Subunit: 156 residues, 2 copies
Amino acid sequence: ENPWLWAVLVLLLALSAFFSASETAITTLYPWKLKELAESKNGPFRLLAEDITRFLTTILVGNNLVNIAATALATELATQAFGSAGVGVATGAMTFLILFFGEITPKSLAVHHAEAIARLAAWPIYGLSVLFYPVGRFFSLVSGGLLRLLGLEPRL
Amino acid sequence: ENPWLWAVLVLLLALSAFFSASETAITTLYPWKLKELAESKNGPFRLLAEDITRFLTTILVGNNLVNIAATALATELATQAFGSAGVGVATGAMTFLILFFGEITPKSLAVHHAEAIARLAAWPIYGLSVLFYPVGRFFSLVSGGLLRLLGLEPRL
Ligand SMILES: [Mg+2]
Ligand SMILES: [Mg+2]
Ligand SMILES: [Zn+2]
Ligand SMILES: [Zn+2]
C-alpha cells in the first residue's frame, strides 16, 4: 500500500468519471445543439459534431481501460492484504466506487454542464482517439466479420 | 489456475455479454416497437415497456459487477503467476476480452436479434432487479443529493 498506488487508483477513477461525463455531455448535446455550437466557433464543437463516432468509440475504449486498470490494481492490493478473499473485497469496493464515482455521479453532473464538459474534453479525447479509435474500429470490424461467419448476422 | 476458476471467468464474460446485448436489444426496440409488442402479448414486452428504467438500471449494475468480478479474478490469476507485472497483463487481457466479447460483439449481435434477446432476457433481469434496481436508485439519489450539496446541480 504505497502512497503512489492509492493516488494512481484515485487518478484512474477520475479518468473514468472524465470519460463517462464526456460521453453524457456529448450525447445530450447531439445532434441539434452540437451543430449550433459547431456553426459558431471555436473550436471543439465542430470537431465533435463532424466525427461523433470517433469520440464515443474512444470513450468506450478509454472508460473500460481505466475501470479495468483500477480494478486490477485494487485487486492486487486486496489480495496481498487478504488473500483469496481479497477478490471479493475488491469486487465489492470497486463496484461501488466505479458505479458511484466513475459512472453515476459524472453522468448526472454532465447533463447540467454538458457544454462546458464537451468543450474541455474534446481535445484530450481527440488526442487519445489517434490510438483508441483505430483499436475500437478494428474490434468492431472483426466482431461483425465473426458474427457473419457464424451466421448470426446477415451475410456479406 | 484451477479448471473451475477458468469456467467462472468464462461465465462472468458470458454474463457481461448477456447484459450488454440486453441493453442494446431493449433500447433499440424502445419506444415504438416495444409498445407494439407490449399491446400484443405475452409477456415480457409489457413488463419491459412499463418500467424500462428498472431494466436499464439493473443492467448497468449487473454489467459493471460482472466486468469487475472477472477483472479481479483474472488479476488474482495473473499476479499469482507473474507478480506485480500481472496487473498490466490482466489489464491488457481483460480490456480485450471485455471490450470484444462483453461489449462490442454482444451489442452488434443484439441489433439484429433485438426481439428474441429482449424476450429471453426480460424475466432474468426482472428477477435481478429486485436487488439491483433499489441499489442503483439509492446510488443515483445519493449522488444527486451530493452534487446539489456541493452546488454542482441546481438547488433542491
Ligand atoms: Mg466511467
Ligand atoms: Mg457487457
Ligand atoms: Zn444556427
Ligand atoms: Zn398496435
